[PDB]
Amino acid sequence: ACPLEKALDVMVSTFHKYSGKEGDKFKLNKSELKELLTRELPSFLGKRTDEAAFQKLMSNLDSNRDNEVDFQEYCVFLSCIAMMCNEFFEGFPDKQ
Amino acid sequence: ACPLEKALDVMVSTFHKYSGKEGDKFKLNKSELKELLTRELPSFLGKRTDEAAFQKLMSNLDSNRDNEVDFQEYCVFLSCIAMMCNEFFEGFPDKQ
Ligand SMILES: [Ca+2]
Ligand SMILES: [Ca+2]
Ligand SMILES: [Ca+2]
Ligand SMILES: [Ca+2]
């Protein structure tokens, strides 16, 4: 098996699972971003599912300032999450 | 247990599976990158497993010019792969 190839497949399909619900089918608007985070990455925002948190996230992800998250911005986001997971790979911050 | 979260875990674990083999345990050298690409992402390089292909790949990934690929650089690489896969999601080039 090639788990990494299957992982990349899931990263692509999961974006479209939500991005195609409304409007531009290649970008996540606020509504679609909320659904994606809540259903697919619940560990990221955890308890922070209020509007202030979602607007902060949209602002952080939306690098080109078009009010939506496109595939490239979404991969930067996932890469950020992966970098944070990577810090705890040993079950403690091996760094110090 | 959410599939996207599992995908991120695979991204993380697969880097360490190879980066820890030689030298700096947190970066991929040429030999480690070859094994990773070959065993885990064989569809990427396809038939281009020659020395010239690997040198070009290493210089493309190693954006800080330290001769190895760190986890951040590896996430940029995986993101590039996903972006390329994503271009074909509709079954035709949906672009301009
Ligand atoms: Ca949309
Ligand atoms: Ca945007
Ligand atoms: Ca190494
Ligand atoms: Ca480097």
Curated annotation (Swiss-Prot), chains A, B:
N-acetylalanine modified-residue sites: 1
Tissue: Ubiquitously expressed.
GO cellular component, one term: perinuclear region of cytoplasm
Modified residues (N6-acetyllysine): 6, 34
InterPro entries referenced in this protein's UniProt entry, alphabetically: EF-hand-dom_pair, EF_Hand_1_Ca_BS, EF_hand_dom, S-100_dom, S100/CaBP7/8-like_CS, S100_Ca-bd_sub
Binding, Ca(2+) 1: 27, 32
Subunit structure: Homodimer. Interacts with PPFIBP1 in a calcium-dependent mode. Interacts with PGLYRP1; this complex acts as a chemoattractant that promotes lymphocyte movement. Interacts with MYH9; this interaction increases cell motility. Interacts with Annexin 2/ANXA2. Interacts with TP53; this interaction promotes TP53 degradation. Interacts with CCR5. Interacts with FCGR3A; this interaction inhibits PKC-dependent phosphorylation of FCGR3A.
Protein name in UniProt: Protein S100-A4
Source organism per UniProt: Homo sapiens (Human)
Encoding gene per record: S100A4
